[PDB]
Amino acid sequence: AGFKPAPPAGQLGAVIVDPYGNAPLTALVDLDSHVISDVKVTVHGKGEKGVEISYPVGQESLKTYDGVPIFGLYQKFANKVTVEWKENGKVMKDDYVVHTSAIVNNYMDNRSISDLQQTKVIKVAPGFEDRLYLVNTHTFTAQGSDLHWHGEKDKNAGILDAGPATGALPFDIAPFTFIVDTEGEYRWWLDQDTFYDGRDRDINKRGYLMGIRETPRGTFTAVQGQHWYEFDMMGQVLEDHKLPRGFADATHESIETPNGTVLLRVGKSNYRRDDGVHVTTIRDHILEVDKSGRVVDVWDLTKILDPKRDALLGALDAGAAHAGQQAKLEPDTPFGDALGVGPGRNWAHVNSIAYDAKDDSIILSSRHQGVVKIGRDKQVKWILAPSKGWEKPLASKLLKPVDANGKPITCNENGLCENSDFDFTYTQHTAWISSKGTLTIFDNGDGRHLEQPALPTMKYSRFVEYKIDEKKGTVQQVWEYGKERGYDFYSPITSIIEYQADRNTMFGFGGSIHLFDVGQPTVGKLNEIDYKTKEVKVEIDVLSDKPNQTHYRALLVRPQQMFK
Amino acid sequence: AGFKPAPPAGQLGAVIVDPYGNAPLTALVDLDSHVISDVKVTVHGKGEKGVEISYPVGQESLKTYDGVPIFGLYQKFANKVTVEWKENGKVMKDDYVVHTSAIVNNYMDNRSISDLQQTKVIKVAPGFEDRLYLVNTHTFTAQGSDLHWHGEKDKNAGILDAGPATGALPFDIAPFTFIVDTEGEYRWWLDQDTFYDGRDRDINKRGYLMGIRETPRGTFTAVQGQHWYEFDMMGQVLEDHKLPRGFADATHESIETPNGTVLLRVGKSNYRRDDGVHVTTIRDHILEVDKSGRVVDVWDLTKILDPKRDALLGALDAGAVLAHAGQQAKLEPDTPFGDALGVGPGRNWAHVNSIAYDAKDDSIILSSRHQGVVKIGRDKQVKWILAPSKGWEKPLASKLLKPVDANGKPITCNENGLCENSDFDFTYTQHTAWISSKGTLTIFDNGDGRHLEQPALPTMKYSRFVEYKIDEKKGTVQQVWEYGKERGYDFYSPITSIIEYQADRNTMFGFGGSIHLFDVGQPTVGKLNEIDYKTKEVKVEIDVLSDKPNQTHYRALLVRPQQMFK
Amino acid sequence: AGFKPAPPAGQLGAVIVDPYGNAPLTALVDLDSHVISDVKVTVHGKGEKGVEISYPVGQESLKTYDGVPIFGLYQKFANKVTVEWKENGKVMKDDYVVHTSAIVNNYMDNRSISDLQQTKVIKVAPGFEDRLYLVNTHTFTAQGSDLHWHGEKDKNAGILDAGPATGALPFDIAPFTFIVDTEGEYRWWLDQDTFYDGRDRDINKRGYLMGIRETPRGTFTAVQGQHWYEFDMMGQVLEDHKLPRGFADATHESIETPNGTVLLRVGKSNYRRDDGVHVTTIRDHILEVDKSGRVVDVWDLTKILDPKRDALLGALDAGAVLAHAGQQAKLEPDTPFGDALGVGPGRNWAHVNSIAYDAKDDSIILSSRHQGVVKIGRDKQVKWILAPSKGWEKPLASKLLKPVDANGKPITCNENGLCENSDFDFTYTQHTAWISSKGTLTIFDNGDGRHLEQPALPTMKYSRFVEYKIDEKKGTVQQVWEYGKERGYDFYSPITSIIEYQADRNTMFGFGGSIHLFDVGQPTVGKLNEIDYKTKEVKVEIDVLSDKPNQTHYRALLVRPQQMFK
C-alpha cells in the first residue's frame, strides 16, 4: 504493497499538518504510543522581530488529539518548532521544521482589493508583544443574499400575490477567521469551508458566523444561521447542533455558562401574533440549551420588554445609500428584517448576552432599546437606558444615574445629563460583566441622545464601564474612553470591549470604522488601553478585503488556556 | 470472521431485495459470474384475479445490474417469481419466493385520510388486464412552502423594507410515486427519499418531482427543483445534474431527444428586465442540455412570444392556477414579481407545462397554459400558434392556425375561439401538447377560462382529450378526434393532466389529475383512462384518490415491462 | 401562493407524524404559541386487549419540541390519542386520530423469513400488562462484511504480498430497533436509515448499533462503528460524535455518568506493540469522553490486565465468539492480528462487553468475556477480579475475590471455578456486569466454556441470571441470587444478552439474545423475561424471533414512558 503512513519525525511520531482539515496553520505531533508528560510547545518567531508562541499542553489534549498540538504557525513557511516533554523520568526535546501551505480566500470578485485582509500595526507598548487576537470578520459572496424564509400571506394582500418572506435568512455571508500577532502576521486560519458553503444551497452551511466565545475548556462556541457549534484551536468541530425546531436565525452571541449550558440569541419561527398572523421573529428570543441541544429555558422578549417603544428606533441612521438619514418608521413596514415595532420586525435587535451566576439571571444588550437584566423568573430586574418611551411597569425598573458620592445626576428623557461626564449607551454592543463585577459596554453612539446630529462627523463611540447597585437601583459611570478620538474611532455597528485583569487594560475592537467612506476598506481597530493611565498599549488596524464591509468582533486569545 | 454475503437462492446468486435502496418492490438475482442469455422473468399474480407481470431482460441490463432485475412485486408479501434462462446451451429455470417489506409514506399529519392513496377500479375491458400505470403524484408536507428566492429591491419600495422574494422556490411538495395494475394494486414504489427530503433544508433535495418521461433506453428522466435526473425501474439513479448556473425552478417536463439531449422547462435567474430590475423569471425558458449537463441551446420565450397578452390571463379561475374558487382572475398593474398571475418577465405570464420535439424540422412544440400551443423553430422563430385570435398582435397574429373542416373549408370562430356550426374548439389552459405516433398533435384541454371567460355557473366546465391535424404549409388546423365534453364537471381537471395516443391497442390514454379538486374536504380524483380510438368505448377506468383532501395529482404514464430492461 | 402548513388539529397546532423523520410511530402536537402546563398524553390500546400508553410531558420537552410529543402509536392504524393540559387556569383536552404509516425493513434477501421479527407472548402476569421493552437487534445485509482496516505488513510476510487487515471494521450489520408491548405489538420503531446505510460506503454510517442506555435526561446514548450518539424517543438525534482520532471500533456499551461524561468501549488505532508492529487493538480500551467528544480519561487494558492469560480463551466454542460449533477453540501462535480469538494486543484477548461506573469510588467495573469481571480504579489499578483462579499470575492473582457463604465462611473451588457443596459458581463469557439499585453486582452468565472446558456433549450448557455481594475490604464475594440453571439449553444464550434488577416491582429483568443460535435454519430467539425476585415466578416472558435464521439479538431495555419526556 500500500502506501505507508508518514514516518516519525523525531522521538515521537509523525508531524501531521492540519490534522482535522480545518486549520492549515496547525500541526500535530503523533504520540505513536509514547507515554509523556510536562509537555511544552514553542513556535519560534519568523525573522528578527517575529513573535514567539509558547504554551503547555495538558493530558486531556494529548489524549484527545493522540499527539501534541502545534498552534501558531506562519503560512507558506518552514516553521521552526520545539517540543519538550518528560518520558520515563527523563527530560526530552525535539526540534521540527513544519512546512505549511497557503491561506485561501474562496470568496473573491471585482470588489476584491486583494485576497486577504491587510493589517497595520500602529502601536505595541513594551510588555504587550506576546498578545494574540482572534478576528471574527467576514467577506461578501458573489451572489449576495439569495434565500428568504417563506411567511404567511396577509389578508390585506392582493388575491393573486405570491406569499411574503419573513425572518432573516438573508443575514448570510462568508467567514474570514484568523488570529493576528503584534507584527500584523496571521498565526491561525479557520478554513472558510469548516462551517460555510456559499456556493451550495444547503441552509445547514449558510448564515453569519458570530458569537465566538471561549468555553471553560479553552474551546470556543459559535453560531451560524440555523446551527450552533463548538470548536478548538486545532480546527476540530466538537459540536454541531441544529437549533430546536421552534427557533431560527441564531446570530451575534453564544456563551457557555458554568452549568454546562449555552445561551443563544435566536428568533421564533411560526410565532403566532395576537392578530393571528404567523411570523419568524427577529433577534428577540434567548435560548438556554444543554450539550444535547435541548432547550433548558427560553426568554421570549416580546412578552418581557416593550416591542412598541420607538424612542430609539425613530432616531436611528437608516444606513446602519440612505446613510445619514434619520429613520422614519412606518405603520405598514412589511414583516421581516426591517426597523419597526412589534413581533415580526427588528424592534429589539439583541446582540449580546451575559450570564450572572450570582442571581441566575441574564444581562442583554438590545441595540434598539438599551441594556436590561432579566431574571430566571422572566421579570425585568433593571434597565439602563434613557427614560423616554418607557411606560409602567417597566419605567420603574430604569436605573437612576448617580455620581461618586451617590448623589443623583440630572438628565433629560433623551439621556443628556447636566454637569456630568455620565452618559447612557446608544445602539450598543457587548454588555458583559467584567472580572471586577462591573458592566462593560461598547457604546457605538448612533442615535446618541435619541437624535441624529447636525453633521455625520459629530458622532463618536466609547468604551464605557458602569457600577450598578441593584438594591438601590442606581448606576454610576466609573470609566470611559474614546469620546475624544472623533470620527476615526466611530464604529456605527458591531464591535466589542472586555476588561483584561492580567495587565489592567480595557481590550476593544471597533469593527466598522470608516464604513461610510464609499469605495474604501472598512477598518477594524484592535486596542488595549491602560485602565489607569488611559495610554494606548496596543493598536492594530485590520482592513477589509472589499470596500464597505464591516467586521464583527475580535477576542484576546491566550495559548496557555487553549490546550487543557 | 465477518458476516458472509447472502448465499445463492437457486442456480444463480442470491436474490437481493431493493438493491439500490430506492425501490422496495424490486429485487435482483445476482449473476454470481454465470454466463446466461434469453432471460425472461415472471412475477405471478396475487390471489385469484391478480395480474401477472412478465418481461424479457437484455444483455445490457444483466451487465449493468450484475444480475436479473425483478420488477412488479407486491408489498409485504411472499411473492412468487420465476426466472428462465439459457446457460451452456441448456434451458434453465428457477422459482423464487421473494418476500418484500412495506411501502412507507413519510409525510403525514392531521390532514391525512390514511397513509397511502386509495385506488378504485371502475372498468377493465377484456384484453386490458395486463396494463400498468405509473402515477406521478404528491403529498403535502407538514410545514408547507418554507423557502423563497431573494430578489432585487424595488426603488418604489419602502426605505426600511427588507428585500422581496422572486421566482418559484415555494413550488415544493413531497412525491408519491407508484405503479398500479388493473386490480388497483401497487406493483412499484419509488422511495420518497430517493430525490426528496422535506424535513432538511438542503435545497438540492427540494422541489416538485415532475416530467417523468421514458428515454430511448427504457429509463426515465425527471426534474425536481434545481436538478434533473435519470432513473430506471430498479430504482437506480443514473443521472443527477444541477441546472446550469443561469437557470432555476425546473418543473412540468423533461424529454430526451433522438440526439442524446434533454429538453427542460426552467426559469432564468438574475434576468435583467428592460427597466433594469433583476428577477427570476417563471416557467418561460426552454433548455436543451446534453448528458454532461451543458447547455446546447436555450429559448427565451419572453423575447419570442408576447408576455403582455392577457386575453386568457384575465379569464382564469382564481382558485386554480381554494376558496377564492369560481372567481374570475382580476389582473393588477402592481402585482409583485413572483409566481403570480400577471403579464411580463417576472410573473407567471406563460406557465409553459409541456414540451415536444419535432425531429422532422428540429423544432419544439410547447404548451403555454396562459397563451396556447406554439411551435418554435431552432431559429427561434414562431412557426405556428394554436389559440383564439384575441390579444395577438402582428407579427404573431399571422402565425395563428386557421380552423378548417374535413373538406378543408374554413370554420367561423369569434376572437374568443367559439366556433359556429362545428365540433371544432381551441384548447384552454391545456397540457401535454405532444406528437402522436400518427404525427398528429394531441392535447389535454383542461378547459378553465374556456372561450376566454368564466362561465355563468362554476360547474359549467368540462375537459377534453383532443387531437388535431395541422397543415403547416397552408397554416390550417383540423380537429380530428375528441372526448370528455359530454362527461361534465365530474370529468373536469382544472389543472395538471395528460393524454397520449397508444397505437398498440388503438386507444387514447389519459389521466385527469384534478377531478373534484375544489370539493372542500374530499380527496382529489386522478382518473386513469384508455378510450377506444374508433368506438370511443371506455376500455380502462381507474381512480386514484389523494391521501389528503384537495391535493392534486400531476400525470401518469402507461408503462411497459417489455421495454424497461434493455 | 405556496402550500400552507398543516392547519391546527384541535385547540393547539397541527399534529405532525414523525417530526424528525427517524421515528414513524411518533407524532407531535404543535404548540402554535400556546402557553400550557400539566401535559398528559394517552395513546389508547388497539382492540380489546390492546395496551394503553400514558405519560406526563415536562416543560423542557415542550420547549425542545415546540409541541407535545406523542409516543406509542401502532403502525398503519388510525390511532386514538388524548392530550390533556392546563391553559389560562382552565383544564383542557383534545382527542386526535393520528394515522400512521408502515414499518419498513430495508435489508431483505433470500434468507428473509418475512420482513419483520415475529413476537410470541408466553406469559404476562397480572400487574405487568403495561411493560414496554426496547429491543436492540439487527438484520443481516445482503453483501455481508465488505470493508477492513488496513494494517502494517509483517516482516515475516511474503515480499510480493499486499498488506494485511487489522481491527474490527467487518463488525457491521443493519439495525432492527423497536419497542414491544405485552401483546407483542410494535409500539416504536427507529428508522434503519437514522444511523445506518449498508448500501453506501460511507464508513461514518457503518457499524453495529449497540450500547443503547438511558441518560439522566430520559434520552439514550448508543455507539455504531466510529461514532457515538444520543437520541430521544421522538427520533431526534441529539449528539453525533466521531471517536477521538486515536481510537476505533466502538461496540457493546455506552453509558453516561453523573458527571456529564460518557464511557465507551473502543480499540486503539495505530497501537505500537513492544515488537514495534502497529495494529488496531480489539475491544480492550475504555474511554471517558465529555459532550464535546473530548477524552477525559482512557484505560488501556493491555497494560492493566493480562493479555497472555488463555485459561478461558482456550476453553471456548468455535461456533460462538456455525458450524464449527461444539468444537473447543484451539489457540494458535501464528493467528494473524485482527478480530480473532487469541492472546496479546492485536487479537481478541479481552472482548470487553459492558461497563459500569461506581460513583462511590470513581471506578469502573468491566465485563471481559474472555477473562472475567474486573474493577479498575481512576488510578488505573485493578481493585478486584471475579474469575476462576487458573491462569492468573501475581500481582493480579492477589486481587481475585474469595468465594464465601452467607455466614462468611470460605467456599472451596478448584482453579476452574467448580465449587464443592455449594450453589456458588463464577461467571463465564458473561455480559452486563452492572451495579443494581441495591448496590449488588448483577451479571448475565452466558456459560460458554463453563469451568474452563467445553462439556461432554454440546447441549450440556446453560445460562444464568446471577447477583453477587462483594466485600471490597475483605476481598470476598457472596452469590446471593440466581436463575436459569435448571432451564437448560432452551434458555442458553451463547452470546450477547443482559440482566437488570428492577426495584419498582422487585423483578430481575433479562433478555437472552441468542437462544437456539446454532439451530441451522431456525430463527434465533430473543427472550424477554421478568422474574419475581422473591418467589422466582415468571411474571413476563416474550419471545422475539429473528427475521433470518441464525441471527443473534444483542440486548433489550425495560423502558418507561414516565421518564421519556422530561
Ligand SMILES: [Cl-]
Ligand atoms: Cl526566520
Ligand SMILES: [Cl-]
Ligand atoms: Cl516553505
Ligand SMILES: [Cl-]
Ligand atoms: Cl521535522
Ligand SMILES: [Cl-]
Ligand atoms: Cl428463494
Ligand SMILES: [Cl-]
Ligand atoms: Cl393500503
Ligand SMILES: [Cl-]
Ligand atoms: Cl413517456
Ligand SMILES: [Cl-]
Ligand atoms: Cl411589466
Ligand SMILES: [Cl-]
Ligand atoms: Cl365527444
Ligand SMILES: [Cl-]
Ligand atoms: Cl385529529
Ligand SMILES: [Cl-]
Ligand atoms: Cl408483521
Ligand SMILES: [Cl-]
Ligand atoms: Cl438503560
Ligand SMILES: [Cl-]
Ligand atoms: Cl503476541
Ligand SMILES: [Cl-]
Ligand atoms: Cl436457580
